[PDB]
Design a binder for this molecule. Structure first.
Ligand SMILES: CC(=O)N[C@H]1[C@@H](OP(=O)(O)OP(=O)(O)OC[C@H]2O[C@@H](n3ccc(=O)[nH]c3=O)[C@H](O)[C@@H]2O)O[C@H](CO)[C@@H](O)[C@@H]1O
Ligand SMILES: CC(=O)N[C@H]1[C@@H](OP(=O)(O)OP(=O)(O)OC[C@H]2O[C@@H](n3ccc(=O)[nH]c3=O)[C@H](O)[C@@H]2O)O[C@H](CO)[C@@H](O)[C@@H]1O
Ligand SMILES: [Mn+2]
Ligand SMILES: [Mn+2]
Lengths: 254, 257
């Protein structure tokens, strides 16, 4: 469990993708264990099929969930024995090279969210925020762009943040269940409030692939504003730091 | 205010025209508090009169005549440096304002490290002996990508507190620099990493940096020689490897994709 990380993957109606991803992730260096957050209420977990195809490099724990809740992967699983957690959605295949490098970045910034998907909030009307990415104008000072969030569905973060999450105001948990969304927006609010630094650091992926609701994006902005009310303040901080691996690919420094 | 700013320290020798050209550029960079020109042309008269004639300029430029032409003259503690950050650049290097503005903001977040555009490293093929080089040499670290253990000071941002700390180094270090008239940057990197326990620097990939040199064989060998010399003086190899390369998110546009 030393200098290792635990992979937490929540799954819902993507069992065939789960097994495909698990086949890849199990072979990544520094992986200590895998916890599958089975959100398919009332369905048998592929653990049987999985074992039959063993042996496997690391332990894979299937934890059947009572309800299909987005926040289930944010609980404090006693089985997590590592300081760091790797959280990936069950439709994303991140290369081992990206994970190895990103994990080494997390070790140097264990209190921030190190991930591959950067996003931000903007404001054109005093106190009213909107959620978005690079299609929206930069908020920050001058040139370039900025991000104030790193989505948790493809990141490394401190396992202590799962406990800390549980201790957030009831209105926050209520909001998450209400929308069954915004869990990562919540995690970013929480982290930056705890550190006073940008909630995360963006690590540009070399090989990350997605294998595969109109108001889904609408809830995004809605949540930011709700969280600002609940917390009585916008804590998110902008950053334009983009980290890549020196020399990987070869000669990428020039 | 001197606080959200940095001081440019440029040492010059036999490049007065190159100096003046660079000055015209650097004087207009945002957050520049002042410029200190370390005049290493022993006996020659400075261009200060010419500078003032073409005034007014955005910031004060102080030309400081030097006793002898020593590489370490730019590492002195100049009383006129009022900032916490120093921007050190060779008088043959032109760095865009964009790079400077971004690099400075990175320095602000890592004030105890050398933020620069030129990454280099040491390698060891025979136990105890080190060699100097760049990306043309194999990687020392485990095995993926490359590594850098130094960020040359000739194009970087670093705490002014280090120029004072450099004066307090073992005479041997000062002697070494004076002996070869080289390795000042290698010494600074040794110093800084010994002080922080972290990699001496962070590499920021430049978007627009150009060498205007055009406008010795032992130089290279001296470098490797200095790493081993310094290792003896410090009874050890303090330099730490890093593979962090920082670029500006969204600059160029969509460079995150
Ligand atoms: C592109 C983007 O903005 N990414 C975010 C978006 O992903 P996105 O909109 O792509 O959401 P997905 O459908 O892929 O689901 C994300 C995760 O939630 C699980 N799931 C999904 C639906 C469901 O009813 N039950 C369930 O458990 C999935 O199995 C997966 O592990 O929303 C998720 C929740 O904020 C975040 O993790 C992603 O970082
Ligand atoms: C790519 C590389 O390895 N870069 C290093 C190399 O640059 P490099 O070999 O290019 O050295 P330069 O000739 O450009 O000189 C660097 C600076 O020193 C001054 N100078 C030079 C010669 C002299 O007799 N007197 C004098 O004061 C120049 O005016 C200039 O400001 O060595 C310099 C000194 O160790 C370092 O700053 C650089 O980080
Ligand atoms: Mn998805
Ligand atoms: Mn040069």
């Amino acid at each position: 469990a030393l200098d290792s990380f635990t992979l937490i993957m929540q799954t819902y109606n993507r069992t065939d993708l789960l097994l495909r991803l698990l086949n890849h992730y199990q072979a990544v260096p520094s992986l200590h264990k895998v916890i599958v957050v089975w959100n398919n209420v009332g369905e048998k977990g592929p653990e049987e099929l999985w074992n039959s195809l063993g042996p496997h490099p690391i332990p894979v724990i299937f934890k059947p969930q009572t309800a299909n809740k987005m926040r289930n992967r944010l609980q404090v699983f006693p089985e997590v024995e590592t300081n760091a957690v790797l959280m990936v959605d069950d439709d994303t295949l991140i290369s081992a090279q990206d994970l190895v490098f990103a994990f080494s970045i997390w070790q140097q910034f264990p209190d921030q969210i190190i991930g591959f998907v950067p996003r931000k909030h903007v404001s054109t009307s005093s106190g009213i925020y909107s959620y978005g990415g690079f299609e929206l104008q930069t908020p920050g000072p001058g040139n370039g762009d900025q991000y104030s969030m790193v989505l948790i569905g493809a990141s490394f973060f401190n396992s202590k943040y799962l406990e800390l999450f549980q201790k957030q105001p009831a209105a926050v948990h209520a909001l998450i269940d209400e929308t069954q969304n915004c869990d990562d927006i919540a995690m970013n609010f929480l982290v930056t409030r705890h550190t006073g630094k940008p909630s995360g650091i963006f690590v540009k992926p070399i090989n990350m692939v997605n294998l595969e609701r109109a108001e889904h994006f609408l809830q995004r902005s809605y949540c930011i504003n709700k969280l600002v009310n609940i917390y009585d303040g916008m804590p998110l901080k902008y950053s334009n730091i983009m980290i890549s691996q020196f020399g990987f690919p070869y000669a990428n420094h020039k």
